[PDB]
Design a protein around this nucleic acid. Structure first.
Lengths: 134, 83, 80, 123, 158, 199
RNA sequence: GAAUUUUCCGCAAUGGGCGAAAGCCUGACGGAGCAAUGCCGCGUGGAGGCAGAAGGCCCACGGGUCGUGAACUUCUUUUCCCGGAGAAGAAGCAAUGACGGUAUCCGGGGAAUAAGCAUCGGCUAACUCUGUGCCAGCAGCCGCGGUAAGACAGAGGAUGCAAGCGUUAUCCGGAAUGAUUGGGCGUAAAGCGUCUGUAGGUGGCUUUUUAAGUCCGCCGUCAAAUCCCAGGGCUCAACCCUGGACAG
């Protein structure tokens, strides 16, 4: 099926950090490769590379965990989509969300490219809010 | 003047064509797209445009009480159901 | 027709008096299409916008008694 | 929450609303003449002789009303004035009587609540 | 040198063929107004002994509140423990502690003088006083978000 | 009623703290008891008794105080402190801290009977907000009264609050700036009163 | 009908009709009157005063409380009352006013003329003693009363508010109890008994293109007055007012 490939990556990373795994393999698409790029520039993951299973192109996604405790603290506590297919959210320059007061950011696809919460405010542009990471 | 596009559903009328305009617009209270469809009675004195053709409608002089729009151009051919 | 004067907004003893651009077939204190300037009786506050005046008077507007006198009290309407 | 696409089809909206005490077109108080002044027994936890009177309102309806305090002077032809409040001990009684108004007299030798019960100031 | 106050003295009784007897329960919260709280539930036969045992259990389960700022919370947090759900939001240095009857009792001890909240779901003083503890444990500050977050090889300073 | 009339030192008692409704009266409360351990006061009791302490000190009503706390909530800046700003700016309170009157309920009568002048002009209203750089003085006709002379005879020795500056000889007092947190010397917690109105 | 006012004054002011004007017409309107209907401000006293006086309530009667409350003393007297002055709303322009014995100001008597209402079991902030005694009555809910009931009735005292108070009616809030922001459907109310399937909703990956949606900027309109921010004028305030903001 795959109704939204932008929504299954959010589910594949969220369930992977809860049961502490090293590498996850998600589907290869240009828009999803743009989300993993602005994830490592802020520092939410290690790095991203290209891979291939059986004629199908997949993307390597290595996660990062903190120090050892009873249950080691995770990088991303919650991952959720705002612009769900069938409920498309659109915002301007003033309606841009302030996630956690500056600690967490919200990644949005703008007209100039792919900007974050701080990057879209400095350019003076808005668009479709994909998801919010914290 | 305003321009709206739509498909012709009925052609069995003298010099008049029934054009169905589809318009997608988000709800101010909610967020998702609500589709509204209203049919306009356009003027066609040359009876060139038949059923299935997608034409654009512009505002003009009212030829009747229900008719106020005219069909000036044509963007594509027949996009209907097969006989 | 259209004319120039002043309306009422401030009730009782304090009569502030409003701006003007209204028809004769309307009310004493009703609809006004454009704004200009006003004056306060028991104060030194005298506005009266000059670029709004003369621009409205050229197209059939009648200058009646009350808009006058407060017009010549300022530097507008003289042999200049 | 009921899904967003079903909220455009059905659209959730409340009812016509039912009133607790039908005192007509939003009127606080209503006038009327008393038809029958009788005595009735309460519910299960209480056991007393409470005075209730059937008031025929100005609209044409004949609903029951409770008389507060000790002692009254309401007859078969008394023009009383109702309030609008439940007692919740006597079934069917949804109204109260405002004493000290019209034919309804105030409670004698009462020194506490003079705003309610309709009692005057003793000198 | 900690401040001690009671939340609710609940009446719990069980009937046996030997009569009707009760073991009273009380919830006591501790604090020093610097950013340190601790709830404690203790059950005993009398009312005075139920407040005493809940005070010893309160100084045992000590948790540090990472507020430390201008008398307010760092960010917005929503936590649900069972049927009870409490939402804690930050405020400006002028607002009071407009929180619940069981929520304000734990927030005045945490040092947060400026806070606004809501009591959703179940309004039980046992489940709502402990739901605010789980909501205050998951609180992050600007410095510990970047230390929890595994950033790649940046330029090292001496 | 505009300002409470009747028993004044009944509220100096009971509440625990000692305000200035008169001069100085004992610490103990009313009745035969109250000198021992009192009962456990609820969470809503600390919000009700603390606002009644601030309402009685200035001699203000509930109708007038409701406006001074709402306009201060809508205005920018720390809400908890700007409640004491518009309440201290009153002509009946600035007269107590000036040394012209022994107490606040006696200072309202001083302003009402036309004894005080503000910037040269005569003001009768006690709920008048005194902005900075204003000269709060006495009148030339009401300079010869024995009550005004006796109250200002005890003032050249005592130290007046830091936001005010009185000159003993010409009988005038100037207000330089706004009163802040550490400048207030009242036994009231301003965070318990703002929490009452927003129930 | 529960309930909502003087069959008043004036053109002086603003405006409308007519007239080259004067001026006339004008219960539009400007004002007054009745009504605590609401909002706002002030007032009905201030300080000082006993070892806590009478007289009440409680009392273990050894006292306590109401009580500085009052009386008794010095003091000031807004507003109301009385007398004398007296801004401005008039711009026009033989100097033109309803309101007006106007606002406001100076003086003279004297505290002299001015407070109550609700509540006090718990939520609800505030106590006992009598009487009655499931009797009479209370009540928003849980519920009180069958002999000592702080939840009846009276009294003392206390609490809250204030010329307002209380009750009732009515909308919203509390009800994330229709939840778009905010909820749920194994057992608490809730998947239709199960499939196929039209409309409708949604739809993998790549590049180019369109760019309609969307987003940026700008130009119109979004009446004024409310609301909000900053700043002014009636002694304050209510009220009135400049500009801006906003009108999503």
């Amino acid at each position: 099926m795959g109704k939204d490939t932008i929504a299954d990556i959010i589910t594949c990373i969220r369930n992977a950090d809860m049961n502490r795994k090293g590498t996850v393999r998600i589907v290869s698409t240009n828009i999803t490769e743009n989300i993993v790029k602005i994830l490592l520039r802020e520092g939410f993951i290690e790095n991203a590379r290209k891979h291939q299973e059986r004629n199908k192109y997949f993307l390597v996604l290595t996660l990062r965990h903190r120090r050892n405790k009873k249950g080691p603290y995770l990088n991303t506590f919650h991952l959720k989509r705002v612009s769900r297919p069938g409920l498309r959210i659109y915002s301007n320059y003033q309606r841009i969300p302030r996630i956690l007061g500056g600690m967490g950011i919200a990644i949005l696809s703008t007209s100039r490219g792919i900007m974050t919460d701080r990057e879209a405010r400095l350019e003076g542009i808005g668009g479709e809010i994909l998801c919010y990471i914290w | 003047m305003k321009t709206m596009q739509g498909r012709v559903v009925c052609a069995t009328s003298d010099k008049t064509v029934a054009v169905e305009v589809v318009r997608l617009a988000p709800h101010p209270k909610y967020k998702r797209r609500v589709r509204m469809k209203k049919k306009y009675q356009a003027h066609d004195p040359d009876n060139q445009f038949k059923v299935g053709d997608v034409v654009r409608l512009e505002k003009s002089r009212p030829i009747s009480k229900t008719k106020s729009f005219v069909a000036l151009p044509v963007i594509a051919r027949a996009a209907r159901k097969a006989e | 027709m259209v004319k120039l004067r002043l309306k009422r907004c401030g009730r009782k003893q304090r009569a502030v008096y409003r701006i003007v651009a209204i028809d004769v077939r309307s009310r004493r204190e009703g609809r006004d299409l454009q704004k200009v300037g006003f004056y306060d009786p028991i104060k030194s506050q005298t506005y009266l916008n000059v670029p709004a005046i003369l621009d409205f008077l050229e197209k059939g507007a009648q200058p009646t008694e009350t808009v006058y006198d407060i017009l010549k009290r300022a530097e507008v309407f003289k042999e200049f | 929450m009921p899904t967003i696409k079903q909220l455009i089809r059905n659209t959730r909206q409340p009812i016509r609303n039912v009133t607790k005490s039908p005192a007509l077109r939003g009127c606080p108080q209503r006038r009327g003449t008393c038809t029958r002044v009788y005595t009735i027994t309460p519910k299960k936890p209480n056991s007393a002789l409470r005075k209730v009177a059937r008031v025929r309102l100005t609209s044409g309806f004949e609903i029951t009303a409770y008389i507060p305090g000790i002692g009254h002077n309401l007859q078969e032809h008394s023009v009383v004035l109702v309030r609008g409040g439940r007692v919740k001990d006597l079934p069917g009684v949804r109204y109260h009587i405002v004493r000290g108004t019209l034919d309804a007299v105030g409670v004698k030798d009462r020194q506490q609540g003079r705003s309610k019960y309709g009692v005057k100031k003793p000198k | 040198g900690f401040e001690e106050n009671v939340v609710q003295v609940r009446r719990v009784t069980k009937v046996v063929k030997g009569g009707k007897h009760m073991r009273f329960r009380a919830i006591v919260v501790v604090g020093d107004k610097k950013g340190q709280v601790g709830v404690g539930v203790g059950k005993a036969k009398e009312v005075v002994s139920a407040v005493q045992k809940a005070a010893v259990d309160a100084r045992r389960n000590i948790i540090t509140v990472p507020m430390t700022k201008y008398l307010t919370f760092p960010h917005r947090n929503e936590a649900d423990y069972g049927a009870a759900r409490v939402m804690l939001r930050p405020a400006a240095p002028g607002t009071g502690v407009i929180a619940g009857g069981a929520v304000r009792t734990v927030l005045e001890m945490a040092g947060v003088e400026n806070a606004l909240g809501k009591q959703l779901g179940s309004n039980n003083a046992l489940n709502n006083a402990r739901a605010t503890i789980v909501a205050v444990q998951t609180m992050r500050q600007f410095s510990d978000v970047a230390r929890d977050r595994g950033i790649p090889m940046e330029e090292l300073w001496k | 009623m505009s300002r409470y009339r009747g028993p004044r030192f009944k509220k100096i008692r009971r509440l625990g703290a000692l305000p200035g409704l008169t001069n100085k009266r004992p610490r103990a409360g009313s009745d035969l008891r109250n000198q021992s351990r009192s009962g456990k006061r609820s969470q809503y009791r600390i919000r009700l008794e603390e606002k009644q302490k601030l309402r009685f000190h200035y001699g203000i009503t509930e109708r007038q105080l409701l406006k001074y706390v709402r306009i201060a909530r809508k205005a920018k800046g720390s809400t908890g402190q700007v409640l004491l700003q518009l309440l201290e700016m009153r002509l009946d309170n600035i007269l107590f801290r000036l040394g012209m009157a022994p107490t606040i309920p006696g200072a309202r009568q001083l302003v009402n009977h036309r004894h005080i002048l503000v910037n040269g002009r005569i003001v009768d209203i006690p709920s008048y907000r005194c902005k900075p750089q204003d000269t709060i003085m006495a009148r030339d006709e009401q300079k010869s009264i024995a009550l005004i002379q006796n109250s200002l005879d005890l003032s050249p020795r005592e130290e007046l609050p830091k936001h005010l500056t009185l000159n003993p000889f010409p009988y005038k007092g100037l207000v330089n700036q706004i009163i802040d947190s550490k400048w207030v010397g009242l036994k009231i917690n301003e965070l318990l009163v703002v929490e009452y109105y927003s129930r």
